[PDB]
């Protein structure tokens, strides 16, 4: 007597059995998990290879995320449609999953925008150590750090476990995957981690790594790395290809100590 | 506001108003031609509404989604994508693109966005049944040199066609009761930006591939299609017939020979004769 929603997510380009690193797939999967956890929806998630013939013919060129509600004969291929259906369901069963917060919206966009500029600038430059970067590349790195600081500041003013309060919202479903992508790509491709002095931001990342919605929907490190390399036309050798999948959900020991001192975790 | 209007010296530079660039999926036959992506046409129509009244500057550019530069520049995002360079902003997600256009429409008192669950259901139900019929008939005709006529189809294929006609009929009925130029009233809204391209796709694909026209007795609907073919927002953003056909062929994996690949592009915006008369004799145009 509760709706079944099937979510199609883009598969890893390395192994089509593994979930890929599309951020919009993780956003909706997180939302759906939040409804699933509390018995408001039935949810199946399926991986798909977007280059496949059956995929193209079945969705006429739509890309994941795609959500299906067969009991209603409804296919939601557009992100507006998927969000609207999940919002309707959240609202129906009084689940506080959606809120409007222009501050979060701006912080999220601006962080990832600067991340993308830095990723491209540094990869092209390296075709190095961040400390040694010349001004014209280093400025992109600094701007990423500035946005990370801004979110640290926001979390520090709010004193909240999640971005808007003590419960998860659509904005965590967007920011947490972006932060984790920033970490994984930072450490592997760019030469940096999130600055250790941003204790609130790190506490929020710990919160992500303790949130079942995030954990269950999180791609392996190798699949995050391949996602960006593939779109950037960066070669991935077979050693890399064959790496057994891992999920790096660790916090630096000194950061964990700082989190305890300031009381930023349970 | 007039009192206030007398107290504002708002500048007269075309470069005052926001510049929004829309990247649209190109034709897979000739990448210089606009493709048939329905979300691209929806937002282009909305941008044109704002463009034509001087609310925004708008440029449109076609892209081969398979190009290395496009993949690298937008990290896998697909058209439609909207750029507002002067704000350093890139809207890659349809929620973001709509959000920005919605904001601007509101800010300048433009009645472009409304909420209507009648309209939203009718649009979805029409295109859903069209897609079912497209897929069912294409598969039925596999291994035949001459395609089947719709009138000869067995019940489990023909039902999708009948459901298409039912939904077209439902929309005709809604328009007849509303007596409006556009779907919701006198002004183009986002729902027109969704239905008019869908209707035109259905008309072109019906005549060219599936063996049917939008029924000629649906006079109010045909009047609304005529409205489309007289709305600059629609006309300017409308792909050529060959690119609409190719769009569905390339995903339905159907064969495009050298000839229709070399077919010179045309845009068929023609109402049937008796239908145009019916429209005139009811004053629907
Ligand atoms: Ca989608
Ligand atoms: Ca898009």
Curated annotation (Swiss-Prot), chain A:
Q: Which UniProt keywords apply?
A: Chloride, Chloride channel, Cytoplasm, Ion channel, Ion transport, Membrane, Transmembrane, Transmembrane helix, Transport, Voltage-gated channel
Q: Name one GO biological process term.
A: regulation of tube size
What GO molecular-function term can you cite, just one?
Answer: chloride channel activity
Task: Give the coiled coil ranges.
Answer: none
- What parts of the sequence cross the membrane? 23-43
Keyword Transcription annotated: no
Q: How does it sit in the membrane?
A: Single-pass membrane protein
Q: Key word Transmembrane helix present in the record? A: yes
* Pfam family for this entry, one: CLIC-like_N
Recorded GO cellular component terms are:
apical junction complex; apical plasma membrane; chloride channel complex; cytoplasm; lysosome; plasma membrane
Compartment list: Cytoplasm; Membrane
InterPro entries (UniProt xref): CLIC_N (IPR053823), Glutathione-S-Trfase_C_sf (IPR036282)
Q: Can you tell which superkingdom this protein's organism belongs to?
A: Eukaryota
Give the residue range of the signal peptide: none
Kindly state the tissue distribution recorded for this protein. Answer: Expressed in the secretory system, hypodermis, vulva, pharyngeal muscle, rectal gland, tubular rectal epithelium cells, and tubular neuronal support cells in the head and tail.
State the protein's purpose: May insert into membranes and form chloride ion channels. Involved in the formation of the excretory canal. Required to prevent cystic lumenal expansions in the excretory cell. Not required for formation of the initial tube, but is required for regulating the size of the tube lumen as it grows.
What do we know about how this protein assembles, alone or with others? Monomer.
Which family does the UniProt entry place this protein in? Belongs to the chloride channel CLIC family.
Q: What is known of its domains?
A: The N-terminal part (1-55) is necessary and sufficient for translocation from the cytosol to the membrane.
Protein name, per record: Chloride intracellular channel exc-4
State the organism named in the record.
Answer: Caenorhabditis elegans
Q: Which gene codes for it?
A: exc-4
């Amino acid at each position: 007597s509760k709706p079944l929603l099937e979510l199609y997510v883009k598969a890893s380009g390395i192994d089509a059995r593994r979930i890929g690193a599309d951020l919009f797939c993780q956003e909706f999967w997180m939302e759906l998990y939040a409804l699933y956890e509390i018995g408001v929806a039935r949810v199946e998630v399926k991986t798909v290879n977007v280059n496949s013939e059956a995929f193209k013919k079945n969705f006429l060129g739509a890309q994941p995320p795609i959500m299906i509600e067969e009991e209603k004969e409804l296919t939601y291929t557009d992100n507006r449609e998927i969000e609207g259906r999940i919002f309707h369901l959240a609202k129906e069963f009084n689940v506080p999953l959606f809120e409007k917060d222009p501050s979060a919206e701006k912080r999220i966009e601006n962080l990832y925008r600067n991340f993308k500029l830095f990723l491209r600038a540094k990869v092209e430059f390296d075709k190095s150590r961040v400390e040694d970067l010349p001004a014209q590349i280093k400025v992109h790195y600094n701007r990423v750090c500035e946005q990370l600081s801004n979110i640290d500041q926001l979390l520090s003013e709010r004193k909240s476990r999640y971005l808007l309060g003590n419960s998860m919202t659509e904005y965590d479903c967007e920011l947490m995957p972006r932060l984790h992508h920033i970490r994984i790509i930072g450490l592997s491709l760019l030469g940096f981690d999130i600055p250790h002095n941003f204790t609130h931001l790190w506490a929020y990342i710990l919160t992500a790594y303790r949130t079942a919605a995030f954990i269950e929907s999180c791609p392996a490190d190798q699949d995050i790395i391949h996602h960006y390399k593939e779109q950037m036309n960066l070669f991935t050798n077979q050693r890399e290809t064959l790496q057994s999948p891992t999920k790096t959900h660790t916090i630096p020991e000194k950061v964990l100590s700082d989190i305890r001192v300031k009381g930023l975790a349970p």
